[PDB]
Design an enzyme around this catalytic site. Sequence first.
Site, short mmCIF file in Angstrom:
data_model
loop_
_atom_site.label_atom_id
_atom_site.label_comp_id
_atom_site.label_asym_id
_atom_site.label_seq_id
_atom_site.Cartn_x
_atom_site.Cartn_y
_atom_site.Cartn_z
CG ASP A 10 53.27 -24.70 -47.55
OD1 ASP A 10 54.08 -24.10 -48.29
OD2 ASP A 10 53.63 -25.48 -46.65
CG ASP A 60 60.62 -25.14 -49.09
OD1 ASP A 60 61.66 -25.70 -49.52
OD2 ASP A 60 59.73 -25.73 -48.44
CG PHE A 61 61.74 -22.12 -55.06
CD1 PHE A 61 62.13 -21.05 -55.84
CD2 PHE A 61 60.54 -22.03 -54.36
CE1 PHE A 61 61.33 -19.90 -55.94
CE2 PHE A 61 59.75 -20.89 -54.44
CZ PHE A 61 60.14 -19.83 -55.23
CE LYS A 62 61.29 -29.57 -49.48
NZ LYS A 62 60.47 -28.34 -49.25
CB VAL A 63 67.20 -25.55 -56.16
CG1 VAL A 63 67.97 -25.52 -57.52
CG2 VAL A 63 66.38 -24.25 -55.97
N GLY A 171 58.21 -29.94 -39.99
CA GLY A 171 57.55 -31.14 -39.50
C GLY A 171 56.95 -30.90 -38.13
CB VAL A 172 57.21 -28.16 -35.69
CG1 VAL A 172 56.49 -27.66 -34.44
CG2 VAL A 172 58.63 -28.62 -35.34
CG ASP A 178 57.94 -31.14 -28.38
OD1 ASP A 178 56.83 -30.81 -27.92
OD2 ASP A 178 59.03 -30.78 -27.86
N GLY A 192 53.62 -24.95 -40.55
CA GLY A 192 52.67 -24.62 -41.61
C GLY A 192 51.22 -24.73 -41.17
#
Lengths: 218, 218
Positions: A10, A60-63, A171-172, A178, A192
Amino acid sequence: VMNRLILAMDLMNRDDALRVTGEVREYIDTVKIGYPLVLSEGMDIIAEFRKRFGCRIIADFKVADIPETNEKICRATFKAGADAIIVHGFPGADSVRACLNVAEEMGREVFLLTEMSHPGAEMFIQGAADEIARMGVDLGVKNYVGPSVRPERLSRLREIIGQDSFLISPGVGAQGGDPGETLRFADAIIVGASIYLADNPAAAAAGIIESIKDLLNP
Amino acid sequence: VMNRLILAMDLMNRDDALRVTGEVREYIDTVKIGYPLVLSEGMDIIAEFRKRFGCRIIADFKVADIPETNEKICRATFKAGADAIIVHGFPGADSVRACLNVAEEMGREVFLLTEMSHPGAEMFIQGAADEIARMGVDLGVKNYVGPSVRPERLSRLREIIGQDSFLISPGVGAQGGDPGETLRFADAIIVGASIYLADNPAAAAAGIIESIKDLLNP
Ligand SMILES: O=c1cc(O)n([C@@H]2O[C@H](COP(=O)(O)O)[C@@H](O)[C@H]2O)c(=O)[nH]1
Ligand SMILES: O=c1cc(O)n([C@@H]2O[C@H](COP(=O)(O)O)[C@@H](O)[C@H]2O)c(=O)[nH]1
């Protein structure tokens, strides 16, 4: 997915992007590329990544549009070389089916995002997540995305989608998930800022891979 | 918005996009630009549209990520010169607030998408629509998007947001919504294919307007 570790690139900056990724290529062969980078440097950034690295790329376009517009988005994304695309479930089955059709017509993959890792996700998404997941199942979805931050909804998600389906979980690191625990339910983790920002990308990645070394293979 | 009519430029060919938009500029000064075109030609297409036509651009990206990522998307988008961006409400208040922040910190506007025009919208969106619009009001959102095809949901939307808020509505033309009845509630209608896929787009725009004539001004 090499080392069960997908880099969330990102960075919003073609040169730092190609550099952090090059510095960690030894550890990962799968990159998630999202709108932060793609809107900053163009869709051609996907190809440049396939060339330099011969990695797999998840767009990752969250269409999240109507069926007719979703088709166009998928068609365009797959033309630029993405191996897979991430699609929202909340817009309903016809919007998800539009993506599935293009994917198969082009022999690529759709990932269904059923639930999200941020606090706002509790407002509307969490309440629908079980039915969105079941909708994915009924639709023939084989790949899913679920949040590493609340391990107990990952488990529920796994229940619903079965061990046949492929599940990847963000979310890691930055967000506090974790890696070890997440991989109890997730086939791969997404990381990321923990990697791409830190002083030593390569070392941050290797430290992650060590921490889950007992979870690698096959 | 001139003639209360917003062109949804969903042509995926740059040349065909710059040309059809050129042919209807007489009639419209506000263009919604979405991912079908942006993913095909790049974010620069927004500035180019701005420096050929001098029009307002609504970046229809249905922003639907975590707060952190939404921020990056809004920054990238506004930096390419978008006057406004359209954001999903379903991911919750923090994701929407994230966009409102960049917008305010850059003197731009956010549109909140509360409800959608396709059959799939009934699955999860419709049930959350009132609460999403209320969340919008509380966050201080002033601009909204709602579907022309479900006139009773538009009316309902207007109740919640007030006459103070700006409301634009797609689904007119191709999807069967009538411009006249929609504008009873919406400040502007969005029209895509019924214009851009017409033999004479200019002509098609006039038939809509001429037929909208009694609702024009101020
Ligand atoms: O529920 C989700 C779904 C996501 O795609 N993501 C994405 O995963 C990535 C997480 O990056 P980070 O490791 O720096 O938190 C971001 O690209 C974000 O948009 C997420 O964080 N939570
Ligand atoms: O609920 C919605 C929200 C939208 O943004 N849209 C968008 O409005 C446009 C409608 O185009 P068309 O007039 O050709 O149906 C498309 O860009 C679509 O993605 C919609 O159709 N329904």
